[PDB]
Design an enzyme around this catalytic site. Structure first.
Site, short mmCIF file in Angstrom:
data_model
loop_
_atom_site.label_atom_id
_atom_site.label_comp_id
_atom_site.label_asym_id
_atom_site.label_seq_id
_atom_site.Cartn_x
_atom_site.Cartn_y
_atom_site.Cartn_z
N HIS B 98 0.78 -1.24 0.00
CA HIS B 98 0.00 0.00 0.00
C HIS B 98 0.83 1.31 0.00
O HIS B 98 0.24 2.39 -0.08
CB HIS B 98 -1.04 0.01 1.13
CG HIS B 98 -2.39 0.47 0.67
ND1 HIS B 98 -3.53 0.13 1.38
CD2 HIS B 98 -2.75 1.20 -0.41
CE1 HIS B 98 -4.54 0.66 0.69
NE2 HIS B 98 -4.11 1.31 -0.39
N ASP B 121 -9.74 -0.60 3.63
CA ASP B 121 -8.62 -1.32 4.23
C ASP B 121 -8.99 -1.70 5.67
O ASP B 121 -9.93 -1.14 6.23
CB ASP B 121 -7.42 -0.34 4.28
CG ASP B 121 -6.03 -0.92 4.38
OD1 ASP B 121 -5.85 -1.91 5.10
OD2 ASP B 121 -5.11 -0.35 3.76
N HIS B 123 -6.60 -1.30 7.86
CA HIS B 123 -5.70 -0.31 8.47
C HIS B 123 -5.90 1.12 7.96
O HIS B 123 -6.41 1.31 6.86
CB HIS B 123 -4.24 -0.72 8.20
CG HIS B 123 -3.97 -2.16 8.48
ND1 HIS B 123 -4.15 -3.12 7.51
CD2 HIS B 123 -3.59 -2.76 9.63
CE1 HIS B 123 -3.85 -4.28 8.08
NE2 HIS B 123 -3.51 -4.11 9.36
N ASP B 125 -3.17 3.38 7.56
CA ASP B 125 -1.96 3.71 6.77
C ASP B 125 -1.58 5.21 6.82
O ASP B 125 -1.05 5.77 5.85
CB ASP B 125 -2.07 3.19 5.31
CG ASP B 125 -2.44 1.72 5.14
OD1 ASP B 125 -2.25 0.94 6.11
OD2 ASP B 125 -2.88 1.34 4.04
N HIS B 138 4.36 0.96 3.98
CA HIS B 138 3.03 0.62 3.45
C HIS B 138 1.89 1.03 4.42
O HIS B 138 0.73 1.06 4.01
CB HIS B 138 2.95 -0.87 3.04
CG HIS B 138 2.90 -1.84 4.18
ND1 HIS B 138 2.12 -2.97 4.12
CD2 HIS B 138 3.50 -1.79 5.40
CE1 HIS B 138 2.28 -3.59 5.28
NE2 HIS B 138 3.10 -2.91 6.09
N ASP B 229 -7.48 -2.06 -0.38
CA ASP B 229 -6.52 -3.04 0.11
C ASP B 229 -7.27 -4.37 0.20
O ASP B 229 -8.42 -4.38 0.65
CB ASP B 229 -5.98 -2.61 1.48
CG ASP B 229 -4.77 -3.38 1.99
OD1 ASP B 229 -4.71 -4.60 1.76
OD2 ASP B 229 -3.93 -2.77 2.69
N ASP B 231 -6.71 -6.85 2.14
CA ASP B 231 -6.85 -7.22 3.54
C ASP B 231 -8.13 -6.63 4.17
O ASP B 231 -8.49 -7.05 5.26
CB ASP B 231 -5.58 -6.91 4.37
CG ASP B 231 -5.26 -5.46 4.65
OD1 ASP B 231 -6.20 -4.64 4.77
OD2 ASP B 231 -4.06 -5.13 4.77
N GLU B 274 -1.90 -5.46 -1.93
CA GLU B 274 -1.50 -6.41 -0.88
C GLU B 274 -1.82 -7.86 -1.20
O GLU B 274 -1.62 -8.72 -0.33
CB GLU B 274 -2.04 -6.00 0.50
CG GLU B 274 -1.66 -4.58 0.93
CD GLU B 274 -0.26 -4.29 1.43
OE1 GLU B 274 0.61 -5.19 1.38
OE2 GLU B 274 -0.03 -3.14 1.87
MN LIG Z 1 -2.95 -0.75 3.14
MN LIG Z 2 -4.00 -3.21 5.36
#
Ligand SMILES: [Mn+2]
Ligand SMILES: [Mn+2]
Ligand SMILES: NC[C@H](CCC[B-](O)(O)O)[C@H](N)C(=O)O
Ligand SMILES: [Mn+2]
Ligand SMILES: [Mn+2]
Ligand SMILES: [Mn+2]
Ligand SMILES: [Mn+2]
Lengths: 323, 318, 318
Positions: B98, B121, B123, B125, B138, B229, B231, B274
């Site tokens: 990312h 995502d 997260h 980031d 990332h 993302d 994830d 990712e």
């Molecule tokens: Mn990310």
């Molecule tokens: Mn992530």
């Protein structure tokens, strides 16, 4: 156990179809539902069981494919004419007819037999709309074409097929509501949109929730007046993680909880006059657990349609045993 | 019909787990171009970029891992993104980690002044090179791009070309579930609007999208950068990811996000990152993640559950 | 800062299935302590209590398996729980089968007589020793602890110390899906409020928690006893359990319950039961069940998906 919330008259039919499509192994379907313990479960729900058993089917030797696409039109059309009589026998007697599949082709018969109750209404629970006309289809498999023959408005768009002369259009546009749609073909989409066929796709379930979906399904159908409900339920309307034993598995399906809710909501209207349970293919599994999960899931749907719930309370308890 | 450009960015220097560079290949091998064509997209395959490596680029201030590599690769990528957007294409970028969003958002900003971002995502980031615990870049891209964070971000080697282009009100997050304490401070303090797994559980993905578009394009139409993302989805659906966080988006939720993005008619650039095939335990689990990625890109450009992309006009009569 | 007491209760005699006694060790190996530490909690670990073994233990009325062994071990646990509640600790009890909730709620009610219970389980466990079909005490704990069921509950060998401590308006069930006909009778006739999977499907986990707290803490703040059975979650998420039942809570829903129990700041005692690592097919199936249990306890003490548990008030500047 001697006391129940309600007692239902349930007629069970085993239809081992395999000619409606091409993937072999869907004929072992009604046998796997029984091996799971279907009858034992319906009995524990306080049902007057009337088993018609596993029907024997014979394919027509001279059966040429119509318009060089529609595979086995005579073998399916005749088998459905006869299954329609078995369903009309039970419904007229006062029984709720459960039909174990097999492929979704057997729906032509069950719904036509049910109709012999003219003001009926269908709830189609599939990943697919099965509304392809013999022209608009691309595969040729009749299991993706049953709704076309049953609809009144689609009479002019559907030609006369061999062994299909017996079918009379019984259900109108407003009398069918779909649930769980995610794999709709381009011609199928045109039919629904133009003919005013109200539906609840996976996307509509995401937006509104299974509760609103069912509420709206009953406001459209049994909203005007009380009507006998036909529940055509396809095992592939569930996510492939839950139902891996099916011919057409589509990702992003109904959760175990969503199907059970649908089944319970049907049971709570007290109008379920017939039920179809299709696409159980035990030959389409990578392990015994996967084969058993689909079979138990199938049983759970039928049972939930006749009382079985998460809260319990189907079986009435007399009094607490005092010491 | 939408003009769509496809760029593959085989880059792994934004993190430590090797294999994320094979992501663009595995998304392509899952029939990405074939699926995009079948929806009626005027395609332009920009290829799988070969970035200029840095021989002497190590641990900076005993924290930041490979910064000169991350910055240069993002610089080269921002030019390609800039070329794609300027021609009139909706830029699809395949990752890779990312950290590549520094490049894709910067290049997109060069032509789009009023651009807004949707960051899907697990997260945020948004760690700065000062708040990070891992040092993995990332999990830092939003800090470099956000204007309100300019004064909080130190000058990193190879990062001198970047200029903050997005404001706090212009970025909405969806599906957060693994947020660092400094990341939470940045979000709350600077009023960066987000919808975490918890907000999804509460409100539902319909209200989440309705609210997201009210925040971003409620007052005026704007080009949408969709930074997605893999994830973001549950590790049961996308196991081939570097940072798997339990309690993710369901397949139905992800498609709904992608569908509602397409429904604005304002998608201008998309990132799908990712996807690390080397990390999935089996070959089929590597294919599951890859196909799920393809479904996101596809749903973002017209593919739906209703099946109304391929237009039908007349029914044949007997 | 929460003062948290961790009690290992290797109970097995409540049911016939072997392996549930390795559950407290399994939760600890999944880093329960490390997770409660970095949450800012003040920790006390009591270890695994070595219960007095009853060799001459015959079945009551030729049905109820191991009553003396269950009754005594529960009385031993009730003292340890009672001690910890006294020292101002939030008593976390790692199981072991759900029969240990007899001792946990009992010991909690000594110092907290106005406690309210949140029972998160697939089953109601309210079977009296005269209704049980299996003769397993793990599905009978609520019967002994319920006030209105005293005249229907017979005196078992080693169950005298138990004085019905909680009333029918003080216990709220969440996650019900395998309720026995006598269990269903009790829940309707004695007016015990519950939220089965159908209630969750209809209302949503947000409305469930709001309604749960309206019934329990609507008139006043009370100590919360969260009795969490791992089989409340779907068997796919929690495989290593003795009585798995399909259509369970999603990971997101289970964390939502916990996060809401934490938001009140009223949690006084928590039990985490039915984690059987022996009943797992693979090594990763057991570790997934254990880690899930670790997420439950941690979420109940602060762990969130937004990240706002650890304090952050100022950003570092370059
Ligand atoms: Mn990310
Ligand atoms: Mn992530
Ligand atoms: N089907 C097993 C049930 C017990 C579950 C207890 B548990 O696992 O929730 O603690 C049942 N109601 C019983 O009485 O044996
Ligand atoms: Mn079908
Ligand atoms: Mn189907
Ligand atoms: Mn229990
Ligand atoms: Mn249980």
């Amino acid at each position: 156990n001697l006391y129940f919330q309600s007692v239902h008259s349930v007629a069970v039919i085993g239809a081992p179809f395999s000619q409606g499509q091409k993937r072999k192994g869907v004929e072992h379907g009604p046998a796997a539902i029984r091996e799971a313990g279907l009858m034992k479960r319906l009995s524990s729900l306080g049902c007057h069981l009337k088993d018609f058993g596993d029907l024997s089917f014979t394919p027509v030797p001279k059966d040429d494919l119509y318009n060089n696409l529609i595979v086995n039109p005579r073998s399916v059309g005749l088998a459905n004419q006869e299954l329609a009589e078995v369903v009309s026998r039970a419904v007229s007697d006062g029984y709720s007819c459960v039909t174990l599949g097999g492929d979704h082709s057997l729906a032509i018969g069950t719904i036509s037999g049910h109709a012999r109750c003219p003001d009926l209404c269908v709830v189609w629970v599939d990943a697919h709309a099965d509304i392809n006309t013999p022209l608009t289809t691309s595969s040729g498999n009749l299991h993706g074409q049953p709704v076309s023959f049953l609809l009144r408005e689609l009479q002019d768009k559907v030609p006369q097929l061999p062994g299909f002369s017996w079918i009379k259009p019984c259900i109108s546009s407003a009398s069918i509501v779909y649930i769980g749609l995610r794999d709709v073909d381009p011609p199928e989409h045109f039919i629904l949109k133009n003919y005013d066929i109200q539906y609840f796709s996976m996307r509509d379930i995401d937006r509104l929730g299974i509760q609103k979906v069912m509420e709206r399904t009953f406001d459209l159908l049994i909203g005007k007046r009380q009507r006998p409900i036909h529940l055509s339920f396809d095992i592939d309307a569930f996510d492939p993680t839950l139902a891996p034993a099916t011919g057409t598995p589509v990702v992003g399906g109904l959760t175990y909880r969503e199907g059970m809710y649908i089944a319970e909501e049907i049971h709570n209207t007290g109008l379920l006059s017939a039920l179809d349970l299709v696409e159980v293919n035990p030959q389409l599994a990578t392990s015994e657990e996967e084969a058993k999960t689909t079979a138990n899931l199938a049983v759970d749907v039928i049972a939930s349609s006749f009382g079985q719930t998460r809260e319990g309370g189907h079986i009435v308890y007399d009094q607490l045993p005092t010491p």
